[PDB]
Amino acid sequence: ELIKENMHMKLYMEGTVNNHHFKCTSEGEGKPYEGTQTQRIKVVEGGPLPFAFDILATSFSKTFINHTQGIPDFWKQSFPEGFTWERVTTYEDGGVLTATQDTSLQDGCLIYNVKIRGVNFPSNGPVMQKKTLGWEANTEMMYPADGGLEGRNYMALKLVGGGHLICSLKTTYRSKKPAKNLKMPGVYYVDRRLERIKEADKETYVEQHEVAVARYCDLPSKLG
Amino acid sequence: ELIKENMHMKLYMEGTVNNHHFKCTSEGEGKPYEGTQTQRIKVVEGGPLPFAFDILATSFSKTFINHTQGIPDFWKQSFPEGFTWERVTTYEDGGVLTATQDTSLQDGCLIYNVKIRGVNFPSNGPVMQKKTLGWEANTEMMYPADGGLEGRNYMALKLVGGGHLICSLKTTYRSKKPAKNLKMPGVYYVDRRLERIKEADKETYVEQHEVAVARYCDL
Ligand SMILES: [Cl-]
Ligand SMILES: [Cl-]
Ligand SMILES: [Cl-]
C-alpha cells in the first residue's frame, strides 16, 4: 500500500520565537500501524536556541498513530495527496506559539514542512531560561468538524525543581483528499507519550520518540 | 471508614445564567471506591430553565472517583472536614460559567452546596436555544499546584445536527484539612463519562449518572 509497515520521514522547520530566528531539519522512521516513530533532529540555523526545545517538540507526525477498534484513520486515508495542520498553543504564563505544517508523500518518503511563530514568552520564564524537563504523557480528544478534524488538549511541561507549566492546544487538521474519498471518524481519543532517546550540545541535536494509540473511551456505558 | 462502600449525597444549588435565576436540589447515592454515582435532580425555583441543562451537569462530586494504581486520594483523605472546589468554564462562543462548591460530611451523608454564575451566553446560541445533547466522555488532567490541586480539560458538548460546542474547564480543589496530614499525588488523569439517564417536564427533573476512574497514562 501507500503507507507501508515501515516508513521514513524528512522534516524542514523554520520559525521565530520572540525575536530569535531558527531552522531545524530532521530525518527518521517509524511503524505507522504500531504507532511508534523516531526522529533525529538538528538545529541547523540560529543555534543554540535561547529557548527550551520542548516548545517545538509537538511540532515535529500524525500518520504514525495506531488506530484501534473501529476508528477510521483520517491521516493514512489522506494519501497520496496528504494533509495539513495548524495549531495555536497558549501557555498560562504568557507565550503563544503558532505552528503550521504540510505533510506530503514523494518517493515513498513522508515530507514535513513546518513554520513556527512564538511570541510573548517571558524573558525570565522557564522557557526562555531553558528550565524545562519534558512533557507529561497525555490524551488528545479528536472530533470531526466540517469534514476536517479538530483536536483540543491541555499539556503539562515539567520544570526544573518540580511543578509544571500548563498550556492549551487548539488544532485543526485538513485532508487534501476530496471528502467523498475518505471515511470520517466519529469522536475518539489518542493516548501519546513523547520522550527523548538522546540529546546533545544544548539541545542542538535531539532524538525524539513517540508512541501513540487511537481508541474509544475505555469506561462502561449505561446507554451505548 | 468515614467514607463507606455506599454513600448517599444531598445537594443544594443556586445560580443565575444570563440573568435567569434558579435553584436546584438533588439526592443520590453511589460507590465511592468503584467510581460510580447517580443523582436525581429537581429544579425547585425558576423552572423550566430557559438554557440547556447540560451547562450545569459538571457542577452536580469528586469523592466518587475510583483511584487505581498508586494514586493517593485527595478527596476521600480530606474528610471529615471535607473540601471546596471552584471552577471557570469558558465556552468557545463567549459563555462563561463560574462555580463555587462546598463539600462537607454530616451524619454519614455527603452534603454539597453549589453556587453558579453564567454570563455572555449568545442569545441565539445552542445553550440559550437548548440545542444540546450531552457531553462526550473526557479526561481531566490533575496536578499538584497552588494551595491544593488543580484540574484542566476541554469538554465537547454535542449539538443537534452533529456538531460540538467546546469549552475549557479550569478548576482548583482546596482541602479544608491541614496539608501535612494528607499524601499528595503527582500528575494523573481522571477518565469520566457523564450520562443523562432521564429528564421530565422540560428538564425540571433530571437523572444523571457518572463513572470516573483515576489512572496514569496507559501506554
Ligand atoms: Cl453570582
Ligand atoms: Cl439570552
Ligand atoms: Cl484536555
Side-chain angles (χ1 to χ4, degrees):
Chain A
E1 213 222 31
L2 279 152
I3 301 303
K4 283 270 210 289
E5 87 165 337
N6 300 288
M7 292 301 285
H8 285 291
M9 69 204 107
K10 294 195 215 294
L11 169 151
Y12 306 87
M13 170 185 285
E14 176 169 20
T16 298
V17 168
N18 286 8
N19 56 12
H20 188 88
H21 180 253
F22 69 96
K23 283 178 174 175
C24 300
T25 51
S26 95
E27 55 88 19
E29 65 293 316
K31 311 265 194 170
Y33 303 94
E34 297 178 27
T36 53
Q37 66 179 300
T38 297
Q39 271 179 60
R40 293 167 284 279
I41 303 161
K42 298 177 186 180
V43 172
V44 295
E45 219 251 56
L49 300 168
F51 54 81
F53 186 96
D54 278 329
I55 69 175
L56 301 182
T58 63
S59 297
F60 291 98
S61 181
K62 310 302 290 192
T63 310
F64 302 81
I65 297 165
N66 176 14
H67 285 66
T68 69
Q69 298 175 287
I71 301 132
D73 191 326
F74 183 84
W75 306 281
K76 287 182 190 72
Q77 286 180 78
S78 290
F79 298 97
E81 305 90 330
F83 61 90
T84 64
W85 61 256
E86 54 88 3
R87 183 174 300 138
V88 180
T89 301
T90 311
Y91 286 78
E92 295 195 339
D93 71 341
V96 174
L97 188 145
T98 306
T100 64
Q101 198 264 25
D102 178 287
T103 298
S104 59
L105 179 70
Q106 33 192 310
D107 269 19
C109 188
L110 293 162
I111 278 85
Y112 306 156
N113 269 286
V114 199
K115 299 287 193 166
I116 299 233
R117 202 144 315 273
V119 301
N120 299 336
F121 288 87
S123 286
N124 287 0
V127 166
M128 296 315 292
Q129 291 305 322
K130 299 178 82 160
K131 285 172 193 156
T132 77
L133 297 175
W135 297 97
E136 300 283 357
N138 58 106
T139 299
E140 193 186 15
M141 176 208 277
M142 302 297 299
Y143 63 102
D146 62 72
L149 229 55
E150 296 267 306
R152 294 290 183 278
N153 196 221
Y154 275 95
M155 280 180 81
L157 179 56
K158 288 141 84 193
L159 304 182
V160 168
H164 285 91
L165 188 58
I166 304 298
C167 59
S168 74
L169 287 72
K170 181 174 168 176
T171 322
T172 299
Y173 308 87
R174 303 180 165 92
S175 186
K176 287 184 203 146
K177 208 175 210 179
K180 61 212 288 284
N181 289 10
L182 33 66
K183 191 166 194 296
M184 221 67 71
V187 173
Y188 67 100
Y189 311 81
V190 177
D191 296 323
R192 60 276 182 88
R193 207 176 64 244
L194 193 42
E195 68 199 20
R196 292 186 177 175
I197 293 160
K198 67 177 97 154
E199 59 180 276
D201 197 18
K202 307 179 159 91
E203 306 183 308
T204 264
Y205 179 106
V206 178
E207 190 176 15
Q208 185 166 290
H209 184 77
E210 177 180 0
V211 182
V213 182
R215 51 148 187 93
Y216 294 118
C217 181
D218 41 295
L219 313 181
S221 180
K222 259 196 153 62
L223 264 67
Chain B
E1 33 112 81
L2 48 153
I3 301 294
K4 310 104 64 188
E5 201 82 62
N6 297 280
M7 290 293 286
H8 295 92
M9 70 203 102
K10 281 201 230 282
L11 170 152
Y12 304 84
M13 167 178 298
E14 176 173 27
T16 302
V17 174
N18 281 28
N19 268 79
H20 187 91
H21 180 258
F22 66 93
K23 279 186 184 177
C24 302
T25 59
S26 82
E27 318 228 29
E29 66 285 313
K31 292 167 185 186
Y33 299 92
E34 287 174 46
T36 61
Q37 65 183 301
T38 298
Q39 282 181 46
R40 287 159 262 107
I41 306 162
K42 308 180 198 178
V43 179
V44 295
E45 197 273 344
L49 303 175
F51 52 87
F53 191 93
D54 289 327
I55 67 160
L56 299 180
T58 54
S59 299
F60 293 95
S61 188
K62 327 295 296 193
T63 305
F64 299 90
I65 292 167
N66 179 2
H67 280 65
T68 74
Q69 305 171 281
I71 315 163
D73 200 314
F74 184 82
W75 302 284
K76 289 185 186 64
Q77 281 168 245
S78 102
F79 294 99
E81 298 91 336
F83 58 91
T84 63
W85 60 259
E86 62 198 58
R87 180 177 298 146
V88 59
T89 297
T90 306
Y91 286 75
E92 284 182 355
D93 66 355
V96 173
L97 195 130
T98 65
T100 59
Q101 205 266 14
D102 176 77
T103 297
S104 49
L105 168 72
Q106 195 210 53
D107 312 330
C109 194
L110 286 164
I111 289 84
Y112 306 159
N113 278 281
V114 201
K115 289 177 180 185
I116 283 166
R117 173 63 68 168
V119 302
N120 294 341
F121 290 85
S123 285
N124 281 112
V127 169
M128 300 308 295
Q129 294 307 305
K130 291 143 124 204
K131 295 184 189 187
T132 77
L133 293 174
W135 298 99
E136 299 293 355
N138 66 97
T139 311
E140 187 188 15
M141 176 181 269
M142 302 294 315
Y143 56 100
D146 216 63
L149 218 48
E150 290 185 18
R152 291 294 183 275
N153 70 127
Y154 277 100
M155 276 183 84
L157 181 53
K158 287 132 92 174
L159 303 175
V160 175
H164 288 89
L165 177 70
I166 306 304
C167 58
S168 63
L169 283 66
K170 297 169 78 172
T171 314
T172 305
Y173 307 96
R174 305 165 193 289
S175 179
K176 293 188 228 161
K177 157 171 277 172
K180 291 179 178 178
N181 265 348
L182 28 70
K183 190 183 283 290
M184 213 67 81
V187 190
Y188 66 96
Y189 314 87
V190 177
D191 284 321
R192 312 82 74 81
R193 165 165 275 150
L194 198 164
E195 286 179 302
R196 178 76 66 75
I197 304 297
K198 176 178 152 80
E199 65 87 10
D201 301 345
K202 307 295 160 199
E203 293 82 34
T204 288
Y205 170 87
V206 171
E207 187 170 329
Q208 220 171 265
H209 178 91
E210 200 194 334
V211 190
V213 178
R215 55 151 187 87
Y216 305 106
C217 217
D218 50 310
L219 294 177

